[PDB]
Design a binder for this molecule. Sequence first.
Ligand SMILES: Nc1ncnc2c1ncn2[C@@H]1O[C@H](COP(=O)(O)OP(=O)(O)O)[C@@H](O)[C@H]1O
Ligand code: BEF
Ligand SMILES: [Ca+2]
Ligand SMILES: [Mg+2]
Ligand SMILES: [Mg+2]
Lengths: 154, 139, 793
Amino acid sequence: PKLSQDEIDDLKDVFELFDFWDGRDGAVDAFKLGDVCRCLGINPRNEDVFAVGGTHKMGEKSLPFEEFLPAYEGLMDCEQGTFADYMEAFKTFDREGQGFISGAELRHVLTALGERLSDEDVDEIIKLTDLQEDLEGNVKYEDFVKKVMAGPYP
Amino acid sequence: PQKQIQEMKEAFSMIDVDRDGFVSKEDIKAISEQLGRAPDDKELTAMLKEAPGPLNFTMFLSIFSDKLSGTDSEETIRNAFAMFDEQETKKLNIEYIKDLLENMGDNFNKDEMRMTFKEAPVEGGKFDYVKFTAMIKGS
Amino acid sequence: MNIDFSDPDFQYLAVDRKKLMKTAAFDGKKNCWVPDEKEGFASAEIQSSKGDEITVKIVADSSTRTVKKDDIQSMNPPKFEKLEDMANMTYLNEASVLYNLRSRYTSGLIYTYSGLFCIAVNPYRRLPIYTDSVIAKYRGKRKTEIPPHLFSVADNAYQNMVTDRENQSCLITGESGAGKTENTKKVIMYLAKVACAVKKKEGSLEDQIIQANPVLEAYGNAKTTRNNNSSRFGKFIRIHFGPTGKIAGADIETYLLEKSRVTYQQSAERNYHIFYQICSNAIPELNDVMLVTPDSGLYSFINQGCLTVDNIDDVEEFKLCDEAFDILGFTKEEKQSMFKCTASILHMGEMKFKQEQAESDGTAEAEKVAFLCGINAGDLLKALLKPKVKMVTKGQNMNQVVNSVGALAKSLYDRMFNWLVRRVNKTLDTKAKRNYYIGVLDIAGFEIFDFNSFEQLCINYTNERLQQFFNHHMFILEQEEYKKEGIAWEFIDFGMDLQMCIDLIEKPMGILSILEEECMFPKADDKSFQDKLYQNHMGKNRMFTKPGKPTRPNQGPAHFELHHYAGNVPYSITGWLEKNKDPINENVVALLGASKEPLVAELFKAQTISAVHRESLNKLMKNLYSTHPHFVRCIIPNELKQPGLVDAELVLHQLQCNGVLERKGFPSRLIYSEFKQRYSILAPNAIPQDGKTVSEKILAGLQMDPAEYRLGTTKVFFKAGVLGNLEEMRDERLSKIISMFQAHIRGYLIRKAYKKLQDQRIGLSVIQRNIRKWLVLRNWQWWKLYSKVKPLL
Ligand SMILES: Nc1ncnc2c1ncn2[C@@H]1O[C@H](COP(=O)(O)OP(=O)(O)O)[C@@H](O)[C@H]1O
Ligand code: BEF
Ligand SMILES: [Ca+2]
Ligand SMILES: [Mg+2]
Ligand SMILES: [Mg+2]
């Protein structure tokens, strides 16, 4: 991408904070390369990060800012999901086609399909978005998709 | 520094043995050996050299005043610890605080760690930061 | 549709869907079919879903079970109950075709349509639906104005012939015992009754056409494990019609009579019905004419499997076979020569022998054979133990002789059956003026046994040419659906493998020709034949394979596998040379050629099975490609011949490859609706907010090559394979989108913690900083002296 000045400044700021947390030394642990990019408003897939150099565990490989910038510009290229992509996908699990999916099914999809999420991450996101199910124990996936796409500060 | 000063005046008159209003090498060498453990004849020179001018109570406060300058208040430091205690239990897990001090920010080397937790108030694996804060700030 | 009241004539034919339309709820999104090991499919209601795993409630007993979402099949709503034509239902899948046939069957309704096809479920009991009173109600009717019945297939094929001015054929197919022969007779009987010509001894043409069955079934049917009256030969009958639309005449072609049954029977089987007829004592006077003792369990050639058959009275059928010859107009001579020759076979199997060279252990038997065959016994006995060829005297041993008697019996029986068929045709060939005909075909279908040999190769090969015929007519149904949807498939590719398998068998270097050339060499044997087949086809053709791992236990030996339309068949080539070429002693032949008995003489009057079959087959196909075909699929409901019983796994299996919309290389098709609901995910960002346009934007989206699909007014069509590829992209797409969403969720959680991470950086900096100061101060000489003095004031 043709990153501007302001954006490389935002990148440097995030890198610095992250370099501070695993111990200030002008380097950032590669296992944290993905989270750095999320702080900058990007939603990369794990496969996307491992491909730009991300590692699988803390204490393996570290990164100076110069090597980050490229990895970043790289993750900026990868495909970002839209609202309509998410609805169609959820629509595939919606038999009645009403906009409902049981809490259990929602948890199943997030924890067992695609790049799985853990049960703690699902509990956390459910609480943060304040997603609650009706008496049948079903949810309105369209609202949930909206809450996630809107961010922690709507 | 207000309540401290007077205390620093009684002390000053206790270090000044020959009672003359000026702390000299002999003044220190005598009070030190008196309460025990005096500095090396070269170490005494350093303590005085830190005060470019005869050492009266004014120069005395000056060196102390400028040494205890810069630090944050007790509330600020107490509130810095509170940022890692979400439950507001007024304690930090021993493993957690050590983890924070040694492996993050400006990493403490192994001696800073030893000197920090040597007299640190710890019980049941919990670090009492409010007590440790009162302790760092003189109390 | 139709009008009909409380007429008994319709008791077993009509569905009064309002004496039975008259008390249960249905919901398409909830009610469905799920696999069931003991009933094929079970009625269920979806409880919940967890991805590819669905939880259902089994409607019968309320039990709960889990089922892959893909194995769930759509259930039709209550309105389509016992529907007469399944092409009208909403869902035409295995599970609902099985439900629709079974419902009607347990209700006594054996006939059901499914588009141009008529399905017949074998009753296994006699029904009152073939009476002349019923034939009075089906005459002239369209299939829609009268319940489903075999008579309508026949009547409509008849109406077409007179209207379209063209020959018609009714191909009645199915497994052994499924009911092909019964149905073929009802069809002929119907035409003989509705179209007979204007106005003991010989009856009229119509009477003879029907009376040909008792004699051919007597000589070509036998009890087998599957069917007490199994056809051991294929048949093609043509009923010719004259100027006024009345029956002008008829002829009959038979194919592949099972020769080995004549001297060998498995456990629980019998030889041809005729032999038990000849030993029943039905007409005591013909006993001394045949020199037989009325005790079937006395002859070796027929007492190997069982002797009697439930539901079959040999005494009674002999009287019927006897009288049928009278009506077909056989003289007392011709007729007795028939029974005489048949009786000789029974005696041939009695000729005992004793221990290098062999000898007769008596002669009583041979005198019977020779007497019935019109030749001297001593001549016979000689030409049997020591043949004199071209003389050149050979020396036969025990076996060679007992194998020579077996071969004479089979060659006799076989020459006789063919004589019978030609004799019956002489009777039916009135030289009346004719215009068009209706041919009814009844041959055995494809089959894969534990042990497959020559006979199976011949049957299967006949079916491979037949399937091709059926595929030709399916392509025409294909091309007319196109135009009805306003499209055109300029260039296709549907039948190369079928023709390829056929060529491997019938071409001039084919499997049959290699056998025909080899059979004309006195020195050749099994291995000799195995080498030519191998050198010409092993590793040189993908249809010709080396036998793999047993597909079933008790699977006999095989030498090569042939990839037929319906499955891989492991064949054994043992005895194939003797099977294709008649191995009878040319010396015993010579004697018979000079018999006193006119029939025997003619039967052996101065050209192999495969050769003969090729010509018959070429002639059959030629006649069929000149007709408009009407297909009837017969299906056997269970293995117990029990009326009303249904064996799911058995019926489903028979629905696997026969046109009932329940494999072809034709383009696939989807109603835009199901498309949009299945693939809108392949291009979500190009869908506005008309299933038809939603389908075009998706395809426009994938930018698929326009040369791979076709715009149907009501559905889209894809070239074979395409739909499979879309299903794959679908998997990848759905999986990636879910991942991007999970990625989005991980992005939310980390962006939520960001602020606290910044606040805490400040916290930790204050703590590390102020502890270091407190530490450096504690090591400051001045602070130390100070610390020592504070305690003293
Ligand atoms: N429509 C029918 N009515 C009465 N019995 C039938 C009918 N169809 C078949 N069967 C019974 O099933 C047996 C097997 O039928 P068949 O027509 O001989 O089968 P296939 O020729 O298909 O091998 C018959 O002998 C008869 O007992
Ligand atoms: F036994 Be049936 F004639 F196929
Ligand atoms: Ca770092
Ligand atoms: Mg002094
Ligand atoms: Mg039959």
